[PDB]
Amino acid sequence: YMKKAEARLLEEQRRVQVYLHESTQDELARKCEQVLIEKHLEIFHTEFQNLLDADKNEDLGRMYNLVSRIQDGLGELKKLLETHIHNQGLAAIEKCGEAALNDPKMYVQTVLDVHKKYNALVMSAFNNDAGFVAALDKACGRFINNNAVTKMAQSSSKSPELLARYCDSLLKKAELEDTLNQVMVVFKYIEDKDVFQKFYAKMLAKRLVHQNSASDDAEASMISKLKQACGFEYTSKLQRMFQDIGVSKDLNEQFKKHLTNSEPLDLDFSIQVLSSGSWPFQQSCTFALPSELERSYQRFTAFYASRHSGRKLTWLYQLSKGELVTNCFKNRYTLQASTFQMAILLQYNTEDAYTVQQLTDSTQIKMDILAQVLQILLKSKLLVLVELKPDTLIKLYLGYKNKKLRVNINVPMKTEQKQEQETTHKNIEEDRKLLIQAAIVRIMKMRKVLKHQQLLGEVLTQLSSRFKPRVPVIKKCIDILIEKEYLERVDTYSYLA
Amino acid sequence: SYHISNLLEKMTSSDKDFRFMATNDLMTELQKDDDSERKVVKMILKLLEDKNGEVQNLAVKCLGPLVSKVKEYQVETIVDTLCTNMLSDKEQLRDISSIGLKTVIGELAANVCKKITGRLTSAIAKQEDVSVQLEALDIMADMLSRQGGLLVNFHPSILTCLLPQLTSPRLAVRKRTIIALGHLVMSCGNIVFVDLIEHLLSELSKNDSMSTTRTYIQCIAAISRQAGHRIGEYLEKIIPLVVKFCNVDDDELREYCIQAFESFVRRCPKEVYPHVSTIINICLKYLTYDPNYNYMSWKVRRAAAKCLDAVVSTRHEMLPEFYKTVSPALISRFKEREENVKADVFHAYLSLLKQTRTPLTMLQSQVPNIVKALHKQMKEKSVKTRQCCFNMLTELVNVLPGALTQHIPVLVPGIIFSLNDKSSSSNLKIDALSCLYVILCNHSPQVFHPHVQALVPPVVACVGDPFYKITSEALLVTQQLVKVIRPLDQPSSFDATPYIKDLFTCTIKRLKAADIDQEVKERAISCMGQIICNLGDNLGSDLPNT
Amino acid sequence: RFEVKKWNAVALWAWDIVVDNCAICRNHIMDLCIECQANQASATSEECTVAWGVCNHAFHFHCISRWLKTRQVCPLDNREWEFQKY
Ligand SMILES: [Zn+2]
Ligand SMILES: [Zn+2]
Ligand SMILES: [Zn+2]
């Protein structure tokens, strides 16, 4: 029927141009369009839904061309398209199940597939109209922030975290530019961007410290894209870490030159000296350095004291790694392990068994950390006796066999990821509170006397680009600001200098 | 007149809060006197160097709306100072000025573009510093992407500085140069395009180095994608060079050549006709390239499969040639070790099937090989392979109704195995159910009679699945199964008594739920209606309750 | 018998001018503020945390917040103060 209507309209145009007067053209066009289209709008809407359900792009384009001739006739199509895109995205995310909670790739790929399909449909069939792209944007913003995955986590902040984890997975060890551009396209619809920024900074710091990045060019391109999308302060924060890495490299080279003149050391030594206020790491637990590492420790401490008198060094032993080549096994094995594994492995050389309390006293490791690292070593088949009791005896298993000469026994613990995620979410909460307080203080400094609604509106319009605040938290921030004697109440508040 | 003076006075208050709030108020006012313009411009320019990051961000954001309100003269000095700061030693000055210049370009006419082009051309030619080169290249790409048609007189000047950079030791410079060249070609004159094309052919005629031939082929692919019709005249010269470079032993070089072939096929169809056979032969030759393994070299296989997909999906008049030579290669390649290339070849053959809908006779003749190759892949532990197999069966039955008459005994067990699998995901189960429904709807009822005893239990189990999409699909399949076991428009000798009770019992629970989703309710109503219509005589006392 | 080939270590540097204590109040940086300790526990006592700056100087958040109400200069250097960590 749509093809028939188009043909009839063209025939009528030819008719009126050929053997009628020119004053009849507009009236004939109006009457023909009305009779042939405007009386079948409900049928057209039902067929629009049917053609959306079963993908037929040419029919959708023809319907768009036909209905475009009627004033205010495209609104129903826009609403139906928005609802269809929202439902399709929700259904696509729901089919993943509980696997999408801990698989960022599946989540982001599903979102990207839905967005790409419907963006192509909008550009092709609907001639890239403003209303249709607006409907697509609204549907994407609705189904990205709230979905089945966010309900399992009981928070809308899971999506930025999954996006950041996907970015980390891509950037760890030609087509990468396209997927980074797609990710940045997804980032536009995120309501809570501060979570994404915090998590991305954490993963970037982890990548830089351990020196596991695919390439520097990819990192530079990602920084440029974040500059295009995010602000300038975040990029400055990241460039601070980059500069610290460069300075550490230069200092390591200088120390390598210095070591040549004096007596050489017995092991290969590399250090990453970093600023304490520009990096997200925290103070390590109590630990006693094994005796054979004391030479490098003292040498570098003396070198840094000579180079910089006013600075002191704090050593993080949970982020250090190295090699332990062993010659007390069936054949020669070299293994990659952290400092804790070195401490709980190098401690016994001529003895074979220990009790945990003796090992705890020797290594000064806390309870939970020692239990976890001992569990990791036990499942590595390099130690033999499931639960670790305080009276348990642990002994080395002689003749350990592996199919590869190089073995990596540095595996992340199970609880570490969950603890890190919970800590990061909490920290995001306190930073949100502090930002709200600072915004209120600045606004009250600018305007001596202000009402409540104006204050709320200004706070939201100032913090909108990062996160959307809630009324209760703003009220609590105002109340705690009153307790600190910053502003006084005269429902109207005034700045108290 | 006084509010502006107060704002400018407060923007130097040595306190970050007052400066931030004053800049915010200024930005708000501008978004809503000749002497006041100079002071505002100078204050913004000086706050671009402020200690606080927030003030710098506010100044950068404010530089945007400023250009529209301010007269033509001060835009020139804003551009001049931004470009001058772009070459400064300080990193913060460099990147803040880059962001500001990008903002100025975004909100914008020909007068400032001339000076920007001059400064960028002067800066790019210098190879002493690479950061300046990269920033200038990216800003030129941004400036050429939009309002690039106003630079007609400066296109040769941009050309003669862009081309020398394709031999730079840094790869990022080469990629940005390729992007800029593509944007230039997207809207330029006739003589400049000829100059660029003959230059690319000139330094491709001589193989100076391996690392530079790759970037030249990548550039030719870029212009092929961007311009399109304008490069179809030079295909007669371009193709032999790519064919010659395909045979080179380097693995990285071959992939770019195949991608260039695919781009030529996709963008310029009219002029690619004489070389379609050559492209097809090269892709067929390199589709099975794996020197190490006998029954990093999967990239060339992916490129070849994608080029075959591009060739098949566009041309429609070569269907007999396709079914003569392309199809057996893909069918033999269904058994490939790599999963990504397997997905690629599956997609290629799906595109061939979609293009098919005489070719039908050839497809019917090829069906047994397809079934034999797919039956082996149906046992794999990977979900993606089984999903692709089910999609291919669905498409094949849709194109050809009675395709699988003689292969039901070997095809049913695969579906049964996929249905009752713990490792199977929801998507695999849904696709298997859809394939079973399509198979049942487009075949004679007599074929499925021996397999009802093995088909009914898995479907009944699928009806009770907690996930409601699988329940809807299972009910939709159950309706057709009921129509199959007891036809009403044809005489059948099959006995349907044993399977009535199970179907009724599984359907009634979904029928009386009052808490399930709407779709499952509709499916349950339809399935129960079909059950009563077809086999309602054998039900007992439950009919009045129903 | 185990032998070590290489050891990659990560270290953090901070100013040694202060002996693990706040400059404004002579209390340990991990303890509470003087005002927080004198007053009863409340909502303010919950948000007592160390705050770092661009100059890599660490003080209590309450201490530096109280200091900044009248001045705009770090206690230990004549440069402007800008928060960079919490
Ligand atoms: Zn203090
Ligand atoms: Zn305190
Ligand atoms: Zn300081």
PDB file of C-alpha atoms in Angstrom, chain B residues 237-443:
ATOM      1  CA  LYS B 237      47.281   1.265 -11.987  1.00  0.00           C
ATOM      2  CA  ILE B 238      46.798   0.612  -8.260  1.00  0.00           C
ATOM      3  CA  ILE B 239      45.738  -3.045  -8.477  1.00  0.00           C
ATOM      4  CA  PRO B 240      48.922  -4.552 -10.035  1.00  0.00           C
ATOM      5  CA  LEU B 241      51.125  -3.048  -7.311  1.00  0.00           C
ATOM      6  CA  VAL B 242      48.941  -4.490  -4.543  1.00  0.00           C
ATOM      7  CA  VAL B 243      48.897  -7.859  -6.317  1.00  0.00           C
ATOM      8  CA  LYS B 244      52.698  -7.805  -6.539  1.00  0.00           C
ATOM      9  CA  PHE B 245      53.035  -6.865  -2.863  1.00  0.00           C
ATOM     10  CA  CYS B 246      50.628  -9.622  -1.783  1.00  0.00           C
ATOM     11  CA  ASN B 247      53.157 -12.334  -2.683  1.00  0.00           C
ATOM     12  CA  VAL B 248      55.806 -10.872  -0.349  1.00  0.00           C
ATOM     13  CA  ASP B 249      56.640 -13.146   2.578  1.00  0.00           C
ATOM     14  CA  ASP B 250      55.955 -10.491   5.239  1.00  0.00           C
ATOM     15  CA  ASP B 251      52.824 -11.342   7.219  1.00  0.00           C
ATOM     16  CA  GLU B 252      51.993  -7.771   8.254  1.00  0.00           C
ATOM     17  CA  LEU B 253      52.175  -6.442   4.687  1.00  0.00           C
ATOM     18  CA  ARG B 254      49.702  -8.999   3.310  1.00  0.00           C
ATOM     19  CA  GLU B 255      46.891  -8.036   5.699  1.00  0.00           C
ATOM     20  CA  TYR B 256      46.994  -4.387   4.621  1.00  0.00           C
ATOM     21  CA  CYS B 257      46.881  -5.447   0.963  1.00  0.00           C
ATOM     22  CA  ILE B 258      43.791  -7.590   1.542  1.00  0.00           C
ATOM     23  CA  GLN B 259      42.148  -4.755   3.485  1.00  0.00           C
ATOM     24  CA  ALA B 260      42.883  -2.428   0.563  1.00  0.00           C
ATOM     25  CA  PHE B 261      41.261  -4.950  -1.782  1.00  0.00           C
ATOM     26  CA  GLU B 262      38.181  -5.046   0.453  1.00  0.00           C
ATOM     27  CA  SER B 263      37.999  -1.244   0.553  1.00  0.00           C
ATOM     28  CA  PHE B 264      38.236  -1.056  -3.242  1.00  0.00           C
ATOM     29  CA  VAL B 265      35.464  -3.646  -3.567  1.00  0.00           C
ATOM     30  CA  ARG B 266      33.172  -1.858  -1.115  1.00  0.00           C
ATOM     31  CA  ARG B 267      33.611   1.791  -2.085  1.00  0.00           C
ATOM     32  CA  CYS B 268      33.962   1.777  -5.905  1.00  0.00           C
ATOM     33  CA  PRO B 269      31.850  -1.032  -7.410  1.00  0.00           C
ATOM     34  CA  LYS B 270      31.621   0.154 -11.017  1.00  0.00           C
ATOM     35  CA  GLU B 271      35.363   0.321 -11.719  1.00  0.00           C
ATOM     36  CA  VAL B 272      36.304  -2.828  -9.757  1.00  0.00           C
ATOM     37  CA  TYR B 273      34.564  -5.227 -12.173  1.00  0.00           C
ATOM     38  CA  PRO B 274      37.652  -6.256 -14.235  1.00  0.00           C
ATOM     39  CA  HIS B 275      39.623  -7.158 -11.077  1.00  0.00           C
ATOM     40  CA  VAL B 276      36.928  -9.050  -9.141  1.00  0.00           C
ATOM     41  CA  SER B 277      38.245 -12.408 -10.356  1.00  0.00           C
ATOM     42  CA  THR B 278      41.803 -11.536  -9.312  1.00  0.00           C
ATOM     43  CA  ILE B 279      40.670 -10.380  -5.861  1.00  0.00           C
ATOM     44  CA  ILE B 280      38.575 -13.531  -5.424  1.00  0.00           C
ATOM     45  CA  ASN B 281      41.482 -15.765  -6.431  1.00  0.00           C
ATOM     46  CA  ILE B 282      43.912 -14.047  -4.045  1.00  0.00           C
ATOM     47  CA  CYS B 283      41.417 -14.277  -1.178  1.00  0.00           C
ATOM     48  CA  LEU B 284      40.748 -17.954  -1.911  1.00  0.00           C
ATOM     49  CA  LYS B 285      44.488 -18.653  -2.009  1.00  0.00           C
ATOM     50  CA  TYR B 286      45.178 -16.898   1.301  1.00  0.00           C
ATOM     51  CA  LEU B 287      42.045 -18.071   3.139  1.00  0.00           C
ATOM     52  CA  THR B 288      43.828 -21.307   4.124  1.00  0.00           C
ATOM     53  CA  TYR B 289      47.248 -19.827   4.949  1.00  0.00           C
ATOM     54  CA  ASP B 290      48.742 -21.599   7.977  1.00  0.00           C
ATOM     55  CA  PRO B 291      52.387 -22.658   7.493  1.00  0.00           C
ATOM     56  CA  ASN B 292      52.942 -23.936  11.039  1.00  0.00           C
ATOM     57  CA  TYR B 293      49.825 -26.101  11.459  1.00  0.00           C
ATOM     58  CA  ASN B 294      48.824 -29.015   9.227  1.00  0.00           C
ATOM     59  CA  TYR B 295      45.534 -30.911   9.337  1.00  0.00           C
ATOM     60  CA  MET B 296      50.694 -14.944  14.144  1.00  0.00           C
ATOM     61  CA  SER B 297      49.026 -15.912  10.866  1.00  0.00           C
ATOM     62  CA  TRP B 298      45.294 -15.709  11.646  1.00  0.00           C
ATOM     63  CA  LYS B 299      45.130 -12.011  10.733  1.00  0.00           C
ATOM     64  CA  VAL B 300      45.626 -12.719   7.025  1.00  0.00           C
ATOM     65  CA  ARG B 301      42.943 -15.419   7.201  1.00  0.00           C
ATOM     66  CA  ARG B 302      40.520 -12.973   8.836  1.00  0.00           C
ATOM     67  CA  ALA B 303      41.317 -10.370   6.181  1.00  0.00           C
ATOM     68  CA  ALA B 304      40.745 -12.867   3.365  1.00  0.00           C
ATOM     69  CA  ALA B 305      37.428 -14.033   4.817  1.00  0.00           C
ATOM     70  CA  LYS B 306      36.268 -10.437   5.325  1.00  0.00           C
ATOM     71  CA  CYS B 307      37.208  -9.558   1.744  1.00  0.00           C
ATOM     72  CA  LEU B 308      35.262 -12.578   0.484  1.00  0.00           C
ATOM     73  CA  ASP B 309      32.289 -11.416   2.559  1.00  0.00           C
ATOM     74  CA  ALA B 310      32.571  -7.931   1.052  1.00  0.00           C
ATOM     75  CA  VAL B 311      32.751  -9.357  -2.479  1.00  0.00           C
ATOM     76  CA  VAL B 312      29.742 -11.634  -1.978  1.00  0.00           C
ATOM     77  CA  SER B 313      27.528  -9.148  -0.121  1.00  0.00           C
ATOM     78  CA  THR B 314      27.698  -6.518  -2.897  1.00  0.00           C
ATOM     79  CA  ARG B 315      27.668  -8.204  -6.316  1.00  0.00           C
ATOM     80  CA  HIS B 316      24.452 -10.033  -7.219  1.00  0.00           C
ATOM     81  CA  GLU B 317      25.089 -11.011 -10.860  1.00  0.00           C
ATOM     82  CA  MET B 318      27.967 -13.366  -9.941  1.00  0.00           C
ATOM     83  CA  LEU B 319      25.877 -15.869  -7.958  1.00  0.00           C
ATOM     84  CA  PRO B 320      26.595 -18.870 -10.260  1.00  0.00           C
ATOM     85  CA  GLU B 321      30.319 -18.092 -10.045  1.00  0.00           C
ATOM     86  CA  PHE B 322      30.024 -17.849  -6.257  1.00  0.00           C
ATOM     87  CA  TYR B 323      28.257 -21.195  -5.926  1.00  0.00           C
ATOM     88  CA  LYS B 324      30.785 -22.699  -8.348  1.00  0.00           C
ATOM     89  CA  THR B 325      33.965 -21.716  -6.515  1.00  0.00           C
ATOM     90  CA  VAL B 326      33.530 -19.701  -3.293  1.00  0.00           C
ATOM     91  CA  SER B 327      31.091 -21.946  -1.409  1.00  0.00           C
ATOM     92  CA  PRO B 328      33.162 -25.187  -1.285  1.00  0.00           C
ATOM     93  CA  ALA B 329      36.139 -23.257   0.110  1.00  0.00           C
ATOM     94  CA  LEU B 330      34.101 -21.832   2.992  1.00  0.00           C
ATOM     95  CA  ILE B 331      32.442 -25.194   3.665  1.00  0.00           C
ATOM     96  CA  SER B 332      35.862 -26.847   3.861  1.00  0.00           C
ATOM     97  CA  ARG B 333      37.047 -23.974   6.078  1.00  0.00           C
ATOM     98  CA  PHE B 334      34.231 -24.474   8.611  1.00  0.00           C
ATOM     99  CA  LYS B 335      36.620 -26.738  10.579  1.00  0.00           C
ATOM    100  CA  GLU B 336      39.206 -24.067  11.401  1.00  0.00           C
ATOM    101  CA  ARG B 337      41.047 -24.065  14.723  1.00  0.00           C
ATOM    102  CA  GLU B 338      40.798 -20.317  15.390  1.00  0.00           C
ATOM    103  CA  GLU B 339      37.423 -19.188  16.712  1.00  0.00           C
ATOM    104  CA  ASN B 340      37.533 -15.619  15.363  1.00  0.00           C
ATOM    105  CA  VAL B 341      38.264 -16.693  11.793  1.00  0.00           C
ATOM    106  CA  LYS B 342      35.572 -19.358  12.197  1.00  0.00           C
ATOM    107  CA  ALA B 343      33.051 -16.667  13.116  1.00  0.00           C
ATOM    108  CA  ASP B 344      34.239 -14.609  10.142  1.00  0.00           C
ATOM    109  CA  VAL B 345      33.741 -17.437   7.628  1.00  0.00           C
ATOM    110  CA  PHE B 346      30.362 -18.276   9.183  1.00  0.00           C
ATOM    111  CA  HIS B 347      29.301 -14.649   8.687  1.00  0.00           C
ATOM    112  CA  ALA B 348      30.552 -14.749   5.093  1.00  0.00           C
ATOM    113  CA  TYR B 349      28.478 -17.811   4.247  1.00  0.00           C
ATOM    114  CA  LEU B 350      25.442 -16.284   5.976  1.00  0.00           C
ATOM    115  CA  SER B 351      25.863 -13.236   3.740  1.00  0.00           C
ATOM    116  CA  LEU B 352      25.997 -15.559   0.730  1.00  0.00           C
ATOM    117  CA  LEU B 353      22.763 -17.237   1.848  1.00  0.00           C
ATOM    118  CA  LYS B 354      21.076 -13.856   2.312  1.00  0.00           C
ATOM    119  CA  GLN B 355      22.202 -12.788  -1.163  1.00  0.00           C
ATOM    120  CA  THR B 356      20.837 -16.023  -2.653  1.00  0.00           C
ATOM    121  CA  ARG B 357      17.199 -15.213  -1.842  1.00  0.00           C
ATOM    122  CA  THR B 358      19.317 -21.183 -10.848  1.00  0.00           C
ATOM    123  CA  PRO B 359      21.197 -20.540  -7.593  1.00  0.00           C
ATOM    124  CA  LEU B 360      18.544 -22.434  -5.617  1.00  0.00           C
ATOM    125  CA  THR B 361      19.362 -25.679  -7.439  1.00  0.00           C
ATOM    126  CA  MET B 362      23.078 -25.247  -6.721  1.00  0.00           C
ATOM    127  CA  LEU B 363      22.331 -24.537  -3.056  1.00  0.00           C
ATOM    128  CA  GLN B 364      20.170 -27.664  -2.859  1.00  0.00           C
ATOM    129  CA  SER B 365      23.000 -29.677  -4.415  1.00  0.00           C
ATOM    130  CA  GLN B 366      25.450 -28.236  -1.867  1.00  0.00           C
ATOM    131  CA  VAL B 367      23.158 -28.877   1.136  1.00  0.00           C
ATOM    132  CA  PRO B 368      24.577 -32.352   2.026  1.00  0.00           C
ATOM    133  CA  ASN B 369      28.114 -30.973   2.357  1.00  0.00           C
ATOM    134  CA  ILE B 370      26.846 -28.133   4.558  1.00  0.00           C
ATOM    135  CA  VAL B 371      25.011 -30.587   6.811  1.00  0.00           C
ATOM    136  CA  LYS B 372      28.012 -32.917   7.058  1.00  0.00           C
ATOM    137  CA  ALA B 373      30.352 -30.044   7.938  1.00  0.00           C
ATOM    138  CA  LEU B 374      27.920 -28.507  10.444  1.00  0.00           C
ATOM    139  CA  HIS B 375      27.140 -31.761  12.267  1.00  0.00           C
ATOM    140  CA  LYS B 376      30.774 -32.108  13.352  1.00  0.00           C
ATOM    141  CA  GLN B 377      30.873 -28.515  14.629  1.00  0.00           C
ATOM    142  CA  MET B 378      27.622 -28.963  16.574  1.00  0.00           C
ATOM    143  CA  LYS B 379      29.487 -31.052  19.188  1.00  0.00           C
ATOM    144  CA  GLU B 380      31.981 -28.328  20.132  1.00  0.00           C
ATOM    145  CA  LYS B 381      32.178 -27.053  23.702  1.00  0.00           C
ATOM    146  CA  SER B 382      32.247 -23.402  22.591  1.00  0.00           C
ATOM    147  CA  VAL B 383      28.920 -21.577  22.679  1.00  0.00           C
ATOM    148  CA  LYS B 384      29.714 -19.276  19.745  1.00  0.00           C
ATOM    149  CA  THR B 385      30.284 -22.106  17.254  1.00  0.00           C
ATOM    150  CA  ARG B 386      26.985 -23.794  18.126  1.00  0.00           C
ATOM    151  CA  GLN B 387      25.175 -20.449  17.968  1.00  0.00           C
ATOM    152  CA  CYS B 388      26.575 -19.813  14.485  1.00  0.00           C
ATOM    153  CA  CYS B 389      25.544 -23.319  13.403  1.00  0.00           C
ATOM    154  CA  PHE B 390      21.969 -22.751  14.579  1.00  0.00           C
ATOM    155  CA  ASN B 391      21.823 -19.356  12.860  1.00  0.00           C
ATOM    156  CA  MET B 392      23.047 -20.921   9.613  1.00  0.00           C
ATOM    157  CA  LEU B 393      20.423 -23.670   9.785  1.00  0.00           C
ATOM    158  CA  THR B 394      17.702 -21.085  10.409  1.00  0.00           C
ATOM    159  CA  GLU B 395      18.829 -18.982   7.442  1.00  0.00           C
ATOM    160  CA  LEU B 396      19.130 -22.023   5.165  1.00  0.00           C
ATOM    161  CA  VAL B 397      15.622 -23.233   6.008  1.00  0.00           C
ATOM    162  CA  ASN B 398      14.260 -19.707   5.547  1.00  0.00           C
ATOM    163  CA  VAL B 399      15.806 -19.425   2.074  1.00  0.00           C
ATOM    164  CA  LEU B 400      14.990 -23.028   1.094  1.00  0.00           C
ATOM    165  CA  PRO B 401      11.862 -24.498   2.752  1.00  0.00           C
ATOM    166  CA  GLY B 402      12.321 -28.238   2.257  1.00  0.00           C
ATOM    167  CA  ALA B 403      16.100 -28.260   2.553  1.00  0.00           C
ATOM    168  CA  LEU B 404      16.613 -30.721   5.428  1.00  0.00           C
ATOM    169  CA  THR B 405      14.140 -33.489   4.556  1.00  0.00           C
ATOM    170  CA  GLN B 406      16.799 -36.222   4.448  1.00  0.00           C
ATOM    171  CA  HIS B 407      19.003 -34.990   7.329  1.00  0.00           C
ATOM    172  CA  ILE B 408      16.553 -34.775  10.250  1.00  0.00           C
ATOM    173  CA  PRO B 409      17.879 -38.015  11.860  1.00  0.00           C
ATOM    174  CA  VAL B 410      21.385 -36.518  12.084  1.00  0.00           C
ATOM    175  CA  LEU B 411      20.292 -32.939  12.844  1.00  0.00           C
ATOM    176  CA  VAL B 412      17.866 -33.585  15.732  1.00  0.00           C
ATOM    177  CA  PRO B 413      20.464 -35.020  18.187  1.00  0.00           C
ATOM    178  CA  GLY B 414      22.565 -31.851  17.975  1.00  0.00           C
ATOM    179  CA  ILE B 415      19.609 -29.672  18.960  1.00  0.00           C
ATOM    180  CA  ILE B 416      18.715 -32.116  21.735  1.00  0.00           C
ATOM    181  CA  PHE B 417      22.284 -32.042  23.068  1.00  0.00           C
ATOM    182  CA  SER B 418      22.394 -28.242  23.002  1.00  0.00           C
ATOM    183  CA  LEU B 419      19.049 -27.970  24.811  1.00  0.00           C
ATOM    184  CA  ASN B 420      19.874 -30.168  27.829  1.00  0.00           C
ATOM    185  CA  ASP B 421      23.370 -28.846  28.530  1.00  0.00           C
ATOM    186  CA  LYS B 422      24.459 -27.280  31.813  1.00  0.00           C
ATOM    187  CA  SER B 423      27.212 -25.266  30.112  1.00  0.00           C
ATOM    188  CA  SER B 424      24.732 -23.874  27.572  1.00  0.00           C
ATOM    189  CA  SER B 425      23.787 -20.234  28.074  1.00  0.00           C
ATOM    190  CA  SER B 426      20.379 -18.610  27.629  1.00  0.00           C
ATOM    191  CA  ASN B 427      21.234 -17.301  24.154  1.00  0.00           C
ATOM    192  CA  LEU B 428      22.221 -20.758  22.900  1.00  0.00           C
ATOM    193  CA  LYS B 429      18.998 -22.300  24.220  1.00  0.00           C
ATOM    194  CA  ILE B 430      16.869 -19.541  22.677  1.00  0.00           C
ATOM    195  CA  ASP B 431      18.594 -19.899  19.304  1.00  0.00           C
ATOM    196  CA  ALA B 432      18.239 -23.693  19.376  1.00  0.00           C
ATOM    197  CA  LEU B 433      14.524 -23.372  20.140  1.00  0.00           C
ATOM    198  CA  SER B 434      14.083 -20.847  17.321  1.00  0.00           C
ATOM    199  CA  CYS B 435      15.892 -23.176  14.909  1.00  0.00           C
ATOM    200  CA  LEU B 436      13.675 -26.082  15.975  1.00  0.00           C
ATOM    201  CA  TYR B 437      10.560 -23.950  15.458  1.00  0.00           C
ATOM    202  CA  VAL B 438      11.692 -22.882  11.979  1.00  0.00           C
ATOM    203  CA  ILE B 439      12.501 -26.493  11.070  1.00  0.00           C
ATOM    204  CA  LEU B 440       9.106 -27.731  12.276  1.00  0.00           C
ATOM    205  CA  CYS B 441       7.180 -24.997  10.457  1.00  0.00           C
ATOM    206  CA  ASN B 442       8.778 -25.713   7.052  1.00  0.00           C
ATOM    207  CA  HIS B 443       8.743 -29.510   6.756  1.00  0.00           C
TER     208      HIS B 443
END
